[PDB]
Paper text:
We examined the structure and function of a gene product with the locus tag CDR20291_0991 (cdPadR1) as part of our broader goal aimed at elucidating transcription regulatory mechanisms involved in virulence and antibiotic resistance of the recently emergent hypervirulent C. difficile strain R20291. cdPadR1 is genomically positioned near genes that are involved in stress response and virulence. We have determined the 1.9 Å resolution crystal structure of cdPadR1, which revealed that it is in the PadR-s2 subfamily of PadR transcriptional regulators with other structurally and functionally characterized PadR-like regulators from B. cereus (bcPadR1 and bcPadR2) and L. lactis (LmrR). We also demonstrate cdPadR1 binding to its own gene promoter in a manner conducive to autoregulation. Additionally, we show that cdPadR1 binds the promoters of three additional regulatory signaling proteins and that a cdPadR1 binding motif is present upstream of 100 genes in C. difficile R20291.
One molecule of cdPadR1 was present in the asymmetric unit and consists of an N-terminal winged helix-turn-helix (wHTH) domain (residues 6–80) and a single α-helical C-terminal domain (residues 81–106). The dimeric state of cdPadR1 is retained in solution as determined by size exclusion chromatography. The recognition helices (α3/ α3’) are positioned ~34 Å apart in cdPadR1, which is consistent with symmetrical binding to two “half-sites” comprised of inverted repeats ~10 bp apart; it is important to note that this distance does not account for DNA secondary structure. Dimerization of cdPadR1 buries approximately 1100 Å2 solvent-accessible surface area (16 %) of the approximately 7000 Å2 total solvent-accessible area per subunit. Residues on helices α1, α2, and α4 that interact to form the cdPadR1 dimer interface are conserved across structural homologues. Helix α4 and α4′of cdPadR1 bend toward each other and interact via a coiled-coil, whereas α4 and α4′ of LmrR do not display a significant bending towards each other at the C-terminus (red). In addition, LmrR contains fewer residues involved in dimerization at the C-terminus of the helix than cdPadR1 and bcPadRs. cdPadR1, like bcPadRs and ctPadR, has a closed dimeric interface, unlike the hydrophobic pore wherein aromatic drug-interaction occurs in LmrR. The P-P, I-I, and I-P distances between cdPadR1 W94 and W94′ are 5.4 Å, 9.2 Å, and 7.4 Å, respectively. The P-P distance is ~2 Å greater for the apo-LmrR (P-P = 6.9 Å), LmrR-H33342 (P-P = 7.2 Å), and LmrR-daunomycin (P-P = 7.4 Å) structures when compared to the distance between phenol centroids in cdPadR1. The lack of a drug-binding pocket in cdPadR1 suggests that any differential expression of the CD630 homologue (CD630_1154) during Mtz exposure would, most likely, be due to a regulatory cascade effect rather than direct interaction of cdPadR1 with Mtz.
Numbering used by the authors:
A (entry chain A), B (entry chain A): 10 to 40, 42 to 106
Write the structure that this text describes.
């Protein structure tokens, strides 16, 4: 359920397709089942936080489904970053 | 909604009454309306995370309603501490 946050964070600096997203979640955290990822990506498309498109069959990677962080998605991410700075301060004080 | 966590954290080392709880939430965080606190305390009593009792009219403070962290409450707190250590690591990596 934290997966939406991870995904918008990954997409901030580059449009990505599924493999790249999963790779970063593995490599940088301790989470991620592939099914879980595709469920999340569809949910975020639905909410217009991300926007999908396709690369060309004749491109280096062949046809992939890429995702773009939308303006709403960018807004969502900045809000999450703000909420995290706040929350992190409190919980460190009381659970640290 | 994070208030339940703050309250069990405060009660870990000492049984407290409302003023003391509110005081620590003020003094150590940036939160807390008194109504919000009494709503939370009743909810936690209901879930048997805390247990209330009363001091004597003739005591230094007169009659106060004190709260004790129960064994279930202690368990809840330890779980929250564990979840926080986990969450904090991930979110720092992706929202920091």
């Amino acid at each position: 359920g934290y997966i939406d946050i991870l995904i918008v964070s990954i997409l901030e600096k580059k449009d990505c397709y599924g493999y790249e997203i999963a790779k970063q979640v593995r490599e940088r955290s301790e989470f991620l089942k592939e099914g879980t990822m595709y469920l999340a990506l569809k949910r975020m498309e639905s909410k217009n936080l991300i926007k999908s498109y396709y690369s060309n069959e004749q491109s280096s990677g062949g046809r992939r489904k890429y995702y773009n962080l939308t303006n709403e998605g960018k807004d969502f991410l900045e809000i999450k970053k703000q909420e995290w700075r706040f929350i992190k301060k409190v919980m460190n004080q009381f659970l640290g």
